[PDB]
Design a binder for this molecule. Structure first.
Ligand code: HEM
Ligand SMILES: O=C(O)c1ccc2ccccc2c1
Ligand SMILES: O=C(O)c1ccc2ccccc2c1
Ligand SMILES: [Cl-]
Length: 393
């Protein structure tokens, strides 16, 4: 009576065509057993939300990828923020929270909006640009590392580093294994930029470091908390911004609606996060016997959370399959929900806003003239190439 399923939600065929299979996983019960990996999973908005909002029953401190840390050697020592539970999680959540506050945002928005306008300009003069490498990658890349206060050298490694991390959450398939064995130079690069002297003052890196001086964090914890933003900080957004553009490309009218009202910018990004959901999936582990979606699940059980699914659940969302920029997007789980809810959402939104804001004032049409190509990854959903023509306003 927990229906089994052959669906492998970490398979290349699944990533290419997720959406029919997701539907199955919601209409198969509110709780399902994937025979493939021996793990329970919940796909509906209903359950997903509940799970995220009960950290006590569904802890994160035993891994939020497949591998239970209670039993297995992590591939690296875990997050202080992501793979920790209240009480422990509160301190580093705090320190990160301050660092990335709407205060901190105000002091940097202008820079971000400026570069956002110049990049849409730069591209418009080409015409045929690749919406990923020339925009979704390029724009985040230009701004975010600088905003961290990183060196120039080495930024090659950022996306491959974050991809590794995001791959390591999945099951021990090909994507994952490969990613690990190619990993060393990426890490060695990141571990280097987390150290105090390599972070220019002003940047999130140094702002984070100051917390060592007050006692707020230790100096061992200091670099670990930076690593944290260099894992979760870029790929996600690259992928979000890319996702957005993909939308306005497939929904011409909805673009006209944005051009017409460019103050809907921020919200157009958000609905895009709902609509594609960059971070697709994430595990928890039970800490007691818990009754979930009608079923009783024993403790120390892994539960997979289908975050994308939740965001497209017909049961919670009117017309889940449509990119509608005016939606009440509040409630979507694209940045998670509850205590771990993306501590960086603001930066992401700042980015997505100004970018889409610029696109709005400056561009007239977006057409996909090319072969569109998909970057596969156990946890991240996004594109590798998206060839577009860009009509100038
Ligand atoms: C638009 C792209 C982004 C998406 C879709 C996204 C998604 C998420 C999600 C779903 C979670 C919850 C994890 C969980 O519940 O276990 C989360 C947490 C987190 N995010 Fe993001 N994020 C994005 C951008 C960012 C940025 C720009 C930063 C850095 C400033 C960031 C840093 C973090 C960190 C450090 C956590 C752990 C939070 C905690 O445990 O309290 N993310 N993010
Ligand atoms: O997301 C990426 O851009 C990316 C690129 C190369 C990657 C190589 C190995 C593992 C993950 C990777 C992710
Ligand atoms: O603290 C980290 O290293 C870390 C790593 C990967 C992460 C992935 C998504 C969100 C937060 C993350 C934090
Ligand atoms: Cl690492």
């Amino acid at each position: 009576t927990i229906p089994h399923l052959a669906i492998d939600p970490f398979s290349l065929d699944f990533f290419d065509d997720p959406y029919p299979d997701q539907q199955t996983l919601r209409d198969a019960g509110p709780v399902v057993y994937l025979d493939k990996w021996n793990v329970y999973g919940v796909a509906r908005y209903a359950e997903v939300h509940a799970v995220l909002n009960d950290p006590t029953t569904f802890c994160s401190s035993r891994g939020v990828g497949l591998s239970d840390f209670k039993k297995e050697k992590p591939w690296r020592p875990p997050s202080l923020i992501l793979e920790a539970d209240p009480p422990a999680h509160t301190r580093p959540r705090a320190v990160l929270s301050k660092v990335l506050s709407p205060a901190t945002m105000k002091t940097i928005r202008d820079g971000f909006a400026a570069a956002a306008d110049a990049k849409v300009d730069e591209l418009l003069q080409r015409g045929c640009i690749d919406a990923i490498a020339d925009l979704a990658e390029a724009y985040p890349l230009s701004v975010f590392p600088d905003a961290m206060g990183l060196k120039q050298e080495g930024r090659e490694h950022l996306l491959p580093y974050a991809g590794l991390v995001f791959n390591a959450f999945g099951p021990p398939n090909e994507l994952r294994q490969t990613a690990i064995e190619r990993s060393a130079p990426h890490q060695a690069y990141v571990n280097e930029q987390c150290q105090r002297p390599n972070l220019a003052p002003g940047g999130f890196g140094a702002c984070i470091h100051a917390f060592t001086d007050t006692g707020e964090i230790t100096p061992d914890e200091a670099p670990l908390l930076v690593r944290s933003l260099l894992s979760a900080g870029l790929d996600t957004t690259v992928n979000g911004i890319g996702a957005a553009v993909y939308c306005l490309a497939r929904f011409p009218g909805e673009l006209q609606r944005l051009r017409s009202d460019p103050t809907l910018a921020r919200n157009a990004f958000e609905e895009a996060v709902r609509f594609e959901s960059p971070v697709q999936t994430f595990f928890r582990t039970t800490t007691r016997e818990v009754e979930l979606g009608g079923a009783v699940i024993g403790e120390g059980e892994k539960v997979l959370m289908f975050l994308g699914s939740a965001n497209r659940d017909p049961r919670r969302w009117s017309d889940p399959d449509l990119y509608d920029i005016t939606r009440k997007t509040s409630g979507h789980v694209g940045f998670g929900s509850g205590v771990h809810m993306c501590v960086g959402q603001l930066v992401a939104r700042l980015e997505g806003e100004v970018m889409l804001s610029a696109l709005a004032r400056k561009v007239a049409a977006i057409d996909i003239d090319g072969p569109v190509k998909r970057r596969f990854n156990n946890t991240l959903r996004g594109l590798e190439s998206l060839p577009v023509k860009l009509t100038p306003a």
